[PDB]
Amino acid sequence: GHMLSKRDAILKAAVEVFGKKGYDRATTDEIAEKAGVAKGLIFHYFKNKEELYYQAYMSVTEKLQKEFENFLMKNRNRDIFDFMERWIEKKLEYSASHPEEADFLITLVSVDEGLRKRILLDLEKSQRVFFDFVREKLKDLDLAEDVTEEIALKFLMWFFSGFEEVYLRTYQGKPELLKRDMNTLVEEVKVMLRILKKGMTK
Template sequence: MHEVVERILKASIEEFSEKGYAAASTNSIAKKAKVSKGLLFHYFKSKENLYIECYKHVLSWSKKKFEEFAKQVKNEDFFEFIKKWGLQKITLAIENPVYSKFLLTVTNLSPKLRAIVLGLIREALLDSREILLEKIKSVKLRRGISEEDALKFITAVFDGVANSYLDQYRDKPEELLNNLERIMVESDKLMDLIKFGILDREPQQLHREV
């Protein structure tokens, strides 16, 4: 990628992350990137297009990180894969907080721009979902539960937990990294809850047999 374009994208992601789309200033972006405003618009045409290209850039980074992770743990079963990816997402968010914060700016966009970005997100998730759906095929699911529904539930649970930890340790990331072993233990407990539920099944089974 052209070095000037890289500078503009970096400055733009920082600006959008800090101020959100509406309040972000192309003047500030040009100043941070050390380019003229005219050159900025020469490459990106409009503020909206600049934001979209930033989102593509960050999604591409996220996808690359997931693919690298998937190769590293390709022999893990589905549940270990999901658990470790949840921890990896926490680590990545701490190592690159600007990207993580930028991804959340989608919540405050206009309906039109949000629709475009959500389309980009769905497209970016296709490859990762294919990997996860292939993994979950090895799991014996309860009758009536589809692989797609199981995947949605499990990823939603671990995404929620990861976001909870990031909120809890937002101002002390080093402490979070030091507590990853404890978080791993808690993740094991959570995975057991997902696998086996929270109810004692024996009384129900006895009642049915009577």
């Protein structure tokens, strides 16, 4: 009759409390209470609140990276706009089905610059898999003689990652509204990717 290891129980309570209160306002005392472990047990596995936040963020993002590399290996041969639309759909569904993780990921803004930099350095290698793929797919595109692969890549990455920032924040704490607006969001995103393709290509 198995439960979560004490480390995974702690990381799950962390994700919940950090997502609710943010980094600065959350306490390891309430994370421990919520994990049903001794206050001293967090220090044992995690040393400080900062390191707890860091490992919880690495654990969630590693979960997402697996989803992605799954998707990537199956959809690699698609047209890139087609690829992005389908991936965005899949991320939308993931977020509505995992609201606590969604809420937790968006707290990265609130933390002090040294912790956020640390996380972004350590995430760069895995975020570069998607970045590098788009870059490579843009070679198979007829770019408007006014538009560099550089501006295309930049615009596309900003659309992809800004769209995520926007819905995670707009639907923070409101999964049923996200589910309610899902089909409209998906249709909006289709037309917008079509605007980009048209404006960007010959």
